[PDB]
Coordinates of N, CA and C in Angstrom, one line a residue:
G1 N 107.3 -176.5 12.9 CA 106.5 -175.9 14.0 C 105.9 -174.6 13.5
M2 N 104.8 -174.2 14.1 CA 104.0 -173.0 13.7 C 103.2 -172.4 15.0
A3 N 103.1 -171.1 15.1 CA 102.3 -170.5 16.1 C 100.8 -170.7 15.8
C4 N 100.0 -171.1 16.8 CA 98.6 -171.4 16.8 C 98.1 -172.3 15.6
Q5 N 98.5 -173.5 15.6 CA 98.0 -174.6 14.7 C 96.6 -175.0 15.1
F6 N 95.6 -174.1 14.7 CA 94.2 -174.2 15.2 C 93.5 -175.5 15.1
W7 N 93.6 -176.2 14.0 CA 93.0 -177.6 13.8 C 93.6 -178.6 14.7
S8 N 94.9 -178.5 15.1 CA 95.7 -179.3 16.0 C 95.2 -179.1 17.4
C9 N 94.7 -177.9 17.8 CA 93.9 -177.7 19.0 C 92.6 -178.4 19.0
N10 N 91.8 -178.3 17.8 CA 90.5 -178.9 17.6 C 90.5 -180.4 17.9
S11 N 91.5 -181.2 17.2 CA 91.6 -182.6 17.4 C 92.0 -183.0 18.8
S12 N 92.8 -182.2 19.5 CA 93.2 -182.5 20.9 C 92.0 -182.2 21.9
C13 N 91.3 -181.1 21.7 CA 90.1 -180.9 22.5 C 89.0 -182.0 22.4
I14 N 88.8 -182.5 21.2 CA 87.9 -183.7 21.0 C 88.4 -184.9 21.7
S15 N 89.7 -185.1 21.9 CA 90.3 -186.2 22.7 C 89.9 -186.0 24.2
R16 N 90.1 -184.8 24.8 CA 89.7 -184.4 26.2 C 88.2 -184.4 26.4
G17 N 87.4 -184.5 25.4 CA 85.9 -184.7 25.4 C 85.0 -183.5 25.0
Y18 N 85.6 -182.5 24.4 CA 84.9 -181.3 23.9 C 84.3 -181.5 22.5
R19 N 83.5 -180.7 22.0 CA 83.0 -180.7 20.6 C 83.9 -179.9 19.6
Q20 N 84.6 -178.9 20.1 CA 85.6 -178.2 19.3 C 86.7 -177.6 20.1
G21 N 87.8 -177.2 19.4 CA 88.9 -176.5 20.0 C 89.5 -175.5 19.0
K22 N 90.0 -174.4 19.4 CA 90.5 -173.2 18.6 C 91.6 -172.5 19.4
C23 N 92.3 -171.5 18.8 CA 93.4 -170.7 19.3 C 93.5 -169.3 18.6
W24 N 94.3 -168.5 19.2 CA 94.8 -167.2 18.6 C 96.1 -166.7 19.3
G25 N 96.3 -167.1 20.6 CA 97.6 -166.7 21.3 C 98.7 -167.7 20.9
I26 N 99.9 -167.1 20.9 CA 101.1 -167.8 20.3 C 101.9 -168.6 21.3
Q27 N 101.6 -168.7 22.6 CA 102.2 -169.6 23.5 C 102.1 -171.1 23.1
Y28 N 103.1 -171.9 23.4 CA 103.1 -173.3 22.9 C 102.0 -174.1 23.6
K29 N 101.2 -174.8 22.7 CA 100.0 -175.6 23.0 C 98.9 -174.9 23.8
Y30 N 98.9 -173.5 23.9 CA 97.8 -172.8 24.5 C 96.6 -172.8 23.5
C31 N 95.7 -173.7 23.8 CA 94.5 -174.0 23.1 C 93.2 -173.9 24.0
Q32 N 92.1 -173.3 23.5 CA 90.8 -173.4 24.2 C 89.9 -174.3 23.5
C33 N 88.9 -174.8 24.3 CA 88.0 -175.9 24.0 C 86.6 -175.6 24.5
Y34 N 85.6 -176.1 23.7 CA 84.2 -175.7 23.9 C 83.2 -176.9 24.1

């Protein structure tokens, strides 16, 4: 495990239907999507 696995947010946001996903906060799976 690691805090803010940024590309793991990206691949997940693309599943939800966004073009990208990123992070910087350390809470578990707290990812933003664009």
